[PDB]
Design a binder for this molecule. Sequence first.
Ligand SMILES: *C/C=C(C)/C=C/C=C(C)/C=C/C1=C(C)CCCC1(C)C
Length: 137
Amino acid sequence: PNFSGNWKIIRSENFEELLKVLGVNVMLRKIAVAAASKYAVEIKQEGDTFYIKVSTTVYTTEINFKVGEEFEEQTVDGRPCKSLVKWESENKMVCEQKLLKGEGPKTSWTKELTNDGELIETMTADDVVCTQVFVRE
Ligand SMILES: *C/C=C(C)/C=C/C=C(C)/C=C/C1=C(C)CCCC1(C)C
């Protein structure tokens, strides 16, 4: 497929419930939901090597990985983790995460290109799934 592009969010569901699972207190959850409405993703894909830059109004981070190759990033609530991305189908990848220290909820994310030109990201903590939908800029 081709995930490359500059993606702009159009919809975000269940994000507050995800942060609650992760222990974020109420006022910060609401602030973070508002921040997620300016969530933007820039992707450069070459083969199965991905360069991804996620940003909001005041914060930006880049995530670089190769499918099937373990790497280090951070969970949504910011704890460092080791991650491994695999393909689930032609246009969908799934990442499993494992905390480097301590314990916590089981987290993961997915990215999918739809046939309608949308990018769908999900983030999971235990039973709760947040879904975010993007279109190309
Ligand atoms: C492939 C996409 C990945 C790895 C996306 C990771 C995104 C995050 C960890 C996003 C976190 C957010 C917050 C904790 C607050 C502000 C809004 C977000 C969505 C940028």
